[PDB]
Design a protein around this ligand. Structure first.
Ligand SMILES: N#Cc1ccc(CS(=O)(=O)NC(=O)C2(c3ccsc3)CCCCC2)cc1
Length: 156
């Protein structure tokens, strides 16, 4: 009744720049294309911070409420739970972690995003798992696009 998996993305941008985007729990729309708004009252970037995101129109859900569980700036780990929303995901926990990597002399970042979530009522484990994996993979591909563009702009 639970399911889990892990997605990865090789990003052609330095860890420090990628982390500077990923750690913004209060502004996931910096790179998540399915978020239209994000409101965080109270303390913004501390364990326990709560965010309410509005999803972009035409999606099968419209809102999510999420809590920051882990914000490790030394190890570059961002841990988040979903606690409310009108999507079908219950007890969803997310962990994204970044690791520097060097491919052919070129330094970059390996992003690894893992999840755990309940298998919804009517849906199956494969159904839920495959759906979430595609969404995370899309989000990690947007992260690469955003940070690789920022890397390029920094090159003047
Ligand atoms: N139906 C549905 C649905 C579609 C888009 C979003 C916006 S989202 O694409 O930004 N959502 C995410 O990235 C997830 C997340 C990661 C850390 S906290 C929440 C991981 C992927 C599954 C949904 C939740 C949320 C729900």
């Amino acid at each position: 009744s639970q399911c889990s998996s892990t997605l990865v993305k090789h990003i052609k941008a330095p860890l420090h720049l990628v982390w500077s985007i990923v750690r913004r729990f209060d502004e996931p729309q910096k790179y998540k294309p399915f978020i239209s708004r994000c409101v965080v009252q109270g303390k913004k970037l501390e364990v326990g911070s709560v965010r309410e995101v509005d999803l972009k129109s035409g999606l099968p859900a419209t809102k999510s409420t999420e809590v920051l569980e882990i914000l490790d700036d030394n190890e570059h780990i961002l841990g988040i739970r979903i606690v409310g929303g009108d999507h079908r995901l219950k007890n969803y926990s997310s962990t994204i972690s970044l690791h520097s990597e060097t491919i052919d002399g070129k330094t970059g970042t390996l992003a690894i995003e893992s999840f755990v979530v309940d298998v919804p009522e009517g849906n199956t484990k494969e159904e839920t798992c495959f759906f979430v994996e595609a969404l995370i993979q899309c989000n990690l591909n947007s992260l690469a696009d955003v940070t690789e563009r920022l890397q390029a702009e920094s090159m003047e």
